[PDB]
Design an enzyme around this catalytic site. Sequence first.
Site, PDB file in Angstrom:
ATOM      1  N   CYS A 181      -1.573   3.804   1.277  1.00  0.00           N
ATOM      2  CA  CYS A 181      -1.159   4.227   2.607  1.00  0.00           C
ATOM      3  C   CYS A 181       0.198   4.961   2.579  1.00  0.00           C
ATOM      4  O   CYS A 181       0.893   4.984   1.545  1.00  0.00           O
ATOM      5  CB  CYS A 181      -1.129   3.024   3.554  1.00  0.00           C
ATOM      6  SG  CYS A 181       0.294   1.948   3.339  1.00  0.00           S
ATOM      7  N   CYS A 204       0.788  -1.239   0.000  1.00  0.00           N
ATOM      8  CA  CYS A 204       0.000   0.000   0.000  1.00  0.00           C
ATOM      9  C   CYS A 204       0.814   1.281   0.000  1.00  0.00           C
ATOM     10  O   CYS A 204       0.267   2.347  -0.255  1.00  0.00           O
ATOM     11  CB  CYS A 204      -1.021   0.026   1.155  1.00  0.00           C
ATOM     12  SG  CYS A 204      -0.441   0.022   2.877  1.00  0.00           S
TER      13      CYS A 204
END
Length: 249
Positions: A158, A76
Amino acid sequence: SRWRQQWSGPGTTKRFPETVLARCVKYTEIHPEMRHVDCQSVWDAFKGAFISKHPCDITEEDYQPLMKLGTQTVPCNKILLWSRIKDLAHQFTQVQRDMFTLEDTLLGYLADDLTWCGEFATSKINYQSCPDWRKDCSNNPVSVFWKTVSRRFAEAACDVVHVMLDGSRSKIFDKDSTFGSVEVHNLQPEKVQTLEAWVIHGGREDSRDLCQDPTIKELESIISKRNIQFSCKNIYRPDKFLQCVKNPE
Ligand SMILES: NC(=O)c1ccc[n+]([C@@H]2S[C@H](COP(=O)(O)OP(=O)(O)OC[C@H]3O[C@@H](n4cnc5c(N)ncnc54)[C@H](O)[C@@H]3O)[C@@H](O)[C@H]2O)c1
């Protein structure tokens, strides 16, 4: 069919089923981590999303079966978004192979540069014409597919997300884009700390700082309001940016 209207967009791409299957096999050949995937099921669910359905009323829920089978975990924190600079974005991930665009995921690889639609109460793919987003309707199989998968790719990102932007265009950041109208608004502030823009230089204009551009300032404002930090870099020489990415030794 007897009731099938003309649309303004190009018809479903020639050899669509066969191109999708071949791409599903190819992807899983090159990516051993995805070999659990049954490509016949992948095709059958994709097909189920739009055939026998009026292609101006396609929903996110129609594509949910495809999404389940296409479930894929990418790291991510190694995500590259982009806007109108496709060639360099993908040349980058071909070299820096731990970074991923949406088109480096299974579902994105399959649908890349293809068109498709069907028709209510028929089992037939429409090769003659498909809805144009502007001239016909926005809830068409292609548009709805991309907004659905683009949302979910953004939702999964992320830490630091990078976005590659085209500095030669009139609107370097453009609100009316998948980046500008789906992805910036669905990055999660819990997960994401920073969105770093990479503005790629080219074209006519003389060399200036493009992170001072009005559209970049607009972008900075949009993401600050979402409680996520903004960073911006000029990439002045794309030629030599790949050279030092591909050969730092
Ligand atoms: N909704 C779509 O039609 C679509 C098609 C292909 C890819 N995608 C999304 S957009 C995202 C990056 O593109 P963007 O942020 O510039 O979004 P966009 O909506 O402006 O561009 C998407 C597509 O528009 C198409 N396009 C752009 N300019 C033209 C053009 N001038 N004539 C015909 N088609 C064009 C082209 O296929 C391009 O891939 C990409 O990674 C995918 O997630 C969306």
